[PDB]
């Protein structure tokens, strides 16, 4: 369980909301006089995944999980489902 | 974070148990340590559980 | 439950001691179902105790004055 | 009146002080089990009738007077107790 306000996630930090979990590509920061600060966070969808655009204010946080991206090795095909293979821990995957 | 906790269930008739932490993703086998039992007053080998 | 000293023991009525006649002496109460006798000191009369729970020391004290304790 | 922007400070972190040091000084009659010296490393080593806790804490193992030595080839400080 993690927390990330809009002054924390800036690039390559996954967020989780309802879901599906998204990814931040690039963002700017505006701290304007009279009013609250915000950030034009250009998010990126992960599942479908085309795009989503939100303008988060100083509130609020979002759950960051999961982030993990790593190199795999394809070796197997059977019917519908496929599998992969690691080289740093040698663990199966579906 | 990584190192979760386990429950050392006594293999004797008592319901006493020790608890400790073991990293499952390094040595995935069970622990068979041999400690004191405050109920039977024996030196029973303990077995790993959740 | 209620605890009873050895001072308020020679004034029950006569010699007999039970849950009643200690209730009339107003030293235990009305809602009492269990009563005991505890070594507290200075018992004189041959007190007869029936149905109470005399711990250890008043049994060596009431019999030292001439009493008999039964269940 | 104009007001320019102000920076930040990365510093500003300190600990609770651990109250280390010599507790009972020399020629002071102590009871058995009294802490004599709290220290991180063994600045003072344990001499006669003085033990060493796991915290490198030199504790008294008998009654008597705290005594400081300069014994040893490496010129180090020991702490002894003359049993009184």
């Amino acid at each position: 369980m993690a927390t990330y306000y809009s002054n924390d996630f800036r690039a390559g930090l996954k967020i989780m909301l309802d879901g599906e979990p998204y990814a931040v590509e690039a963002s700017e920061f505006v701290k304007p006089g009279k009013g609250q600060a915000f950030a034009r966070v250009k998010l990126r969808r992960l599942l479908t995944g085309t795009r989503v655009e939100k303008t988060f204010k100083s509130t609020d946080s979002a759950e960051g999980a999961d982030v993990v991206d790593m190199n795999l090795t394809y070796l197997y095909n059977d019917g519908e489902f496929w599998h992969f293979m690691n080289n740093e821990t040698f663990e199966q995957l579906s | 974070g990584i190192r979760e906790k386990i429950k050392l269930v006594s293999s004797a008739g008592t319901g006493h148990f020790y608890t400790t932490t073991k990293n499952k993703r390094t040595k995935p086998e069970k622990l068979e340590l041999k400690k004191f039992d405050p109920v039977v007053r024996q030196h029973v080998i303990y077995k790993e559980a959740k | 439950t209620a605890e009873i000293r050895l001072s308020d023991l020679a004034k029950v009525e006569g010699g007999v001691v039970d849950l009643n006649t200690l209730k009339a002496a107003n030293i235990i109460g009305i809602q009492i179902e269990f009563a005991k006798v505890i070594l507290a000191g200075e018992v004189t009369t041959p007190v007869t105790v029936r149905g109470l729970r005399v711990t250890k020391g008043a049994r060596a004290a009431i019999e030292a004055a001439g009493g008999k304790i039964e269940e | 009146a104009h007001k320019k922007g102000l920076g930040s400070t990365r510093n500003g972190r300190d600990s609770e002080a651990k109250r280390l040091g010599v507790k009972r000084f020399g020629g002071e009659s102590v009871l058995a089990g009294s802490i004599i010296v709290r220290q991180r490393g063994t600045k003072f080593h344990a001499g006669a009738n003085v033990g060493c806790g796991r915290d490198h804490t030199l504790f008294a193992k008998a009654d008597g007077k705290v005594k400081f030595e300069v014994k040893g080839p490496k010129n180090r400080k020991f702490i002894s107790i003359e049993a009184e």
């Binding site: - | 906790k5 608890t19 400790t20 932490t21 | - | -």
Partner: protein, 64 residues
């Protein structure tokens, strides 16, 4: 009207023989397996209330 005793204090203390109060230590509800055995033995029996926080206990319960 009479004084109403705070019920959160009467269920956490008990009157001793000479006016003092005993209490239960508070470290004993969760992740204790990170603590040592010596920390989990001296917190098991009851201990007395220190005199620095004794006047608050007497004031919050007059009857007991």
């Amino acid at each position: 009207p009479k004084i109403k005793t705070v019920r959160g204090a009467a269920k956490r203390f008990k009157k001793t023989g000479k006016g003092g109060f005993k209490h239960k230590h508070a470290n004993l509800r969760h992740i204790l397996t990170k603590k040592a055995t010596k920390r989990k033995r001296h917190l098991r029996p009851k201990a007395m209330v220190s005199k620095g926080d004794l006047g608050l206990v007497i004031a919050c319960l007059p009857y007991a």
